[PDB]
Amino acid sequence: TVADGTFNSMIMPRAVIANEREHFMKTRIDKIEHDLNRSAKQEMMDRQSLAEDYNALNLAVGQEIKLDIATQHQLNRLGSAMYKADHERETELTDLINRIRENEVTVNGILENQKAITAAERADLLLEVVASTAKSVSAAGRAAADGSGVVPVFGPSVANGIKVGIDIADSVAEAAIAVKESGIITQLNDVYHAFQSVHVAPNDVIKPAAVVAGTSTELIGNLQAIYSRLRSHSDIGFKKATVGDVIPNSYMIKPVNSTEYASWQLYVIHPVQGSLGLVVQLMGDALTYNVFAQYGNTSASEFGKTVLTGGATNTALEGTKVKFQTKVTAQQALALTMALKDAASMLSQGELIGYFEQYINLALEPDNLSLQDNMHKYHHLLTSQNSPIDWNYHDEEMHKWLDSRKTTNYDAMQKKDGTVIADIHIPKVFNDLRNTTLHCKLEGKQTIAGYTVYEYLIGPWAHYGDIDYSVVVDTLNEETKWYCEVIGIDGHLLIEKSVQHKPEKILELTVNDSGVTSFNGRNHDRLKLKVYVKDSLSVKVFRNWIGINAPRVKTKMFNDHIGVKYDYSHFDKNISPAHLTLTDLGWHTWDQYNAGNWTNIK
């Protein structure tokens, strides 16, 4: 069965970043995917409707979101897409957590008796004993199961056709200000051309979570801890565009005239969704890395203080520079870098280059089984309580650093041009992703007796204060009646509104410093909202914080998640609005309903 060696070259991983056509091919299908689901022509159309809904929320002075200004519209397009994709992933994680809890006995048996097998095999076994909607952990299968919302945001396509250079000179006329508001500064244009969002599926996270888990509770806690870190980094990514600075671009340095036996590669990753960066050097068969902070950088150096060291890296190497956008987080990239260092002796140089570049550019796990296991083990360590990196310290310092930059840039522009021009180009309302007043358009694929069900998940909140939720419903028919259902642990609340084309407030909630709210006398970490509409065309949900720049709740870790457990099993049940009666509306606990009929009270 000895081969002639031709087959092994075909399964050899390839240098996607270094090879230009491979880098040209990937940009094209990422652009096509973004335009398939988010159309520029459609988005420009709904600008007028969105502007009216934002104005109709009756926000306080100084907190209004004016979509008529070009800068605010552009930041809304990035924010709404980023928030949407994160929302589906959180919804998928909640569904997965429910399925694990129904099959705890079977899951516990797998975790105890399957320590020998690979991480991928354990994940496949876990997703089979549970009735998971997606049962594939391979990269190809995950792409097929991925929906429309979770598609990463392609920055250059968003900032296409937007006017940049508008010059009014010493003119304070209303006509001149109107023309000025229609454009964006050059700085925002460079920000979008270097922006690509990364959203990690729950199926990819189950492999790190189950690699050392021994009980179902630990597996759930590991899953929640990772998504607490993942969601926190997505907020930082949006705030980077809000400030007046220009985000750095990841790049790779290769020799200008490479040699066969003396080639070297240097990779610099600048994750937009993160507070730390990575520098990886490949000289011969030796691999070295350095984790550096993305905050506190001076003008002279693009690298901040390095917080974790894995050798000596020379960032002053001379050669050709190739720019690229990462598809993995800093933690995911670091996990492979540690794994690649250990297996450097047993791996060829081509394997070292190919495996690393495929993961950063295409989010492709290595075909090697031993390499795959070590990476997922290192991924668990970096996201655990015993992690070598204190993520909470670096996330908080990035937040402080970004706030100082916004004040410095706004004051600098105020002196040069004025207050009115500064507000146009540096809006102070947007701030963080979860702080910002944003809308999430909802898709409904379930119809109960002619009523389409639209599902929204309230929380989890990384910020505390007072939050309001509003729903806008557009229908073809006139004089319709639509219902809203808010589900908790104890029961659900049913509301009838029957108003279209305008926002209508459905909930006002108060969140404390621990990110928990008191819904009818019980502590809830999250709630599920379902909107039932007949012959619907569009359903939009708005969230709004009463004050601007709401303070942040400390990011939860593994111990915080196992300390308190909340039941989400009731989020699946729904009602039939066609069979509703007048006495059924209001707040009603389950004890009142019969088993299986949550529409009509006993």
Partner: protein
């Protein structure tokens, strides 16, 4: 033993007379020189006291 809210830093001084010192921990731990980046956790450290 650390009873505080966050991780603490303990400074070790082994003098300048001894040639080599080998440190072993019950669990993997991080050690680095003064004002130097911390490495990944590992069981054993070989250090020069000077």
């Amino acid at each position: 033993l650390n009873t505080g809210a966050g991780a603490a830093n303990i400074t070790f001084n082994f003098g300048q007379i001894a040639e080599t010192v080998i440190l072993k921990g019950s669990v993997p731990f991080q050690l680095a020189r003064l004002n130097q980046p911390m490495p990944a956790a590992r069981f054993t450290y070989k250090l020069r006291p000077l």
